[PDB]
């Protein structure tokens, strides 16, 4: 409310209120799968110009 004029005697004063707010951040975990050649098997796919089938 508006401030209180301090004149003579007074008990009822205007008040200053407070409030709190909570902010939450969410973190999500995701995954992908990929296919590749086997380590020992790459030697049979090491073509002259490139490696891989």
């Amino acid at each position: 409310a508006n401030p209180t004029t301090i004149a003579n005697e007074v008990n009822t004063i205007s008040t200053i209120g407070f409030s709190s707010e909570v902010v939450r951040l969410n973190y999500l975990k995701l995954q992908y799968k990929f296919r590749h050649l086997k380590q020992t098997s790459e030697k049979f796919y090491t073509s002259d110009s490139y490696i891989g089938d």
Partner: protein, 153 residues
């Protein structure tokens, strides 16, 4: 129209006696006051000193004010005024009050009600009992010791 006399006096007031020195218009507050009384203040419209007050609302640009009035709109009793700031000290109708108040131009024990102009008058919806007789201060100014107990059914 003023809490203190508007014109200066020309005589030194002798302070020898101690009886009947409180029947003055400058006696602000109450005769018996509790340290637990609830005291408010509001901007004044008019001069509601020693009178019952109601709430007055304007266009909406400025806050509400208190003006002399009674009946079903009674909000409290004005007991003091600060003239510089236009402030009116108000005791709510829900709080007990005992003091000198303006009377309409009456023996102790007579029930009283606040009229339209905030003046006590002899009898309906407010507990007000005169504790003394009307003391005349001016041609149209009469004060009386009264006690307010709230609203009756």
């Amino acid at each position: 129209l003023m809490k203190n006399p508007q014109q200066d006096s020309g005589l030194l007031s002798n302070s020898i006696d101690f009886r009947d020195q409180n029947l003055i218009f400058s006696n602000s507050g109450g005769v018996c006051t509790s340290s637990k009384d609830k005291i408010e203040n509001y901007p004044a419209k008019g001069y509601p000193y020693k009178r019952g007050v109601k709430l007055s609302f304007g266009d909406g640009t400025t806050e509400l004010e208190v003006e002399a009035g009674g009946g079903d709109d009674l909000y409290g009793v004005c007991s003091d005024i600060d003239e510089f700031s236009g402030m009116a000290t108000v005791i709510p109708i829900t709080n007990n009050f005992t003091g000198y108040l303006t009377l309409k131009k009456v023996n102790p024990g007579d029930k009283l009600n606040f009229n339209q102009h905030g003046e006590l008058e002899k009898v309906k919806s407010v507990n007000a009992i005169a504790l003394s007789k009307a003391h005349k201060l001016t041609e149209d100014l009469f004060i009386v010791l009264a006690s307010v107990f709230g609203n009756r059914a």
